[PDB]
Amino acid sequence: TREHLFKVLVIGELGVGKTSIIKRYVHQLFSQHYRATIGVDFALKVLNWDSRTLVRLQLWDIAGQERFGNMTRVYYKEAVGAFVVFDISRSSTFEAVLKWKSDLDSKVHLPNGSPIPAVLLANKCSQVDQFCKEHGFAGWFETSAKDNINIEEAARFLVEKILVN
Amino acid sequence: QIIHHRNFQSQFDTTGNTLYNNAWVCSLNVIKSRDGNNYSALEDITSDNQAFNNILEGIDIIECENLLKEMNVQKIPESSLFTNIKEALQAEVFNSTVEDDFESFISYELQNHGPLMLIRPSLGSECLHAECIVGYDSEVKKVLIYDSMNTSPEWQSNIDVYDKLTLAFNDKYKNEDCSICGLYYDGVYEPKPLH
Ligand SMILES: Nc1nc2c(ncn2[C@@H]2O[C@H](COP(=O)(O)OP(=O)(O)O)[C@@H](O)[C@H]2O)c(=O)[nH]1
Ligand SMILES: [Mg+2]
């Protein structure tokens, strides 16, 4: 029996759906309204990965820093995985993927020198163009926070890659 | 070097598999309690408060703004050191002199005004967060942090706590004109004499 605490970052340009992905995955919820509240510093999902191992997953929303691109130490500190999110049907946010990925790999990495697993999320529901995964992405998914189409499977894929390390 | 004996509370449940949005309760209990006991906040939380033990969201800004007044929790007084720090937070510098003022600013407040609460934008969530400064150690250059997201109090580095103050005092990070962000202290705190 084992228990794991994994910290993953949800990064991407403004308006792609980073928060909606977290809101859907953790709270089974998708709403349009917003409540300014004082609660938590990040989000938590717990998964019964298998009969012996338990995985606690911290989803860190980049939040305000998304507008600037640079990450603070206290944010990327000790991250073991990452979700790079862009808005499909909008070419402006796919250009910024390379900017977010480069900044990620330079600030945080595995303790053995390798890059952290990163999953590219094409939100808001081309397929031949999976060569972009040559940039260091472990995989990509077509996700939708409104309909909950691939967010579940995209998360298990990241946990799987983290668990190999 | 200087540490206040205040009790630590986590906004996780005993098993650790549930994350409540109780940071506002824990932080308040730190600065209002004494001698490692718990403050009588049972009247506020237990009274079927929707913000207490909530998975989705915590207390509302406007509601918490009034709650701080009720419990005599004010923003720390203005001071020259405080101005130096705020001026440095706007530029995001942390050299030798800024760290010298940081050491003096933290150590002064803890001695004269007791533990401090920090209302700041959350690092990994679109809401706000609350954590407490309960002590300081000038030999290792660390500050004792009571963050209810953690399992216990943590001696965190000055650079890391400085980067977290930046979120609350730099317009680059605080948005929607949330005037509730800042450093608070217990109004009824009485410092001990120096000699
Ligand atoms: N149709 C659709 N809209 C979405 C989806 N995810 C997010 N949105 C919309 O995108 C807008 C901004 O998304 P948001 O969660 O704020 O992304 P963020 O700014 O990166 O955190 C919101 O108004 C949502 O309604 C989705 O899966 N489908
Ligand atoms: Mg967001």
Residue numbers in the entry:
A (entry chain B): 21 to 145, 156 to 195
B (entry chain A): 23 to 217
Provide text from the study:
The protein GtgE has been identified as a cysteine protease that targets members of the Rab-family. It is believed that GtgE inactivates Rab32 proteolytically and thereby prevents the delivery of antimicrobial factors that would impair Salmonella infection.
Crystals obtained after reductively alkylating the truncated Rab3218-201:GDP:GtgE21-214,C45A-complex and the full-length complex Rab321-225:GDP:GtgE1-228,C45A diffracted up to 2.3 Å and 2.9 Å resolution, respectively. The X-ray structures of the complexes were solved by the molecular replacement technique using the coordinates of Rab32:GppCH2p (PDB ID: 4CYM17) and truncated GtgE (PDB ID: 4MI77) as appropriate search models. The average B-factor of the full-length complex is higher than for the truncated complex, though the entire electron density is well defined for both structures.
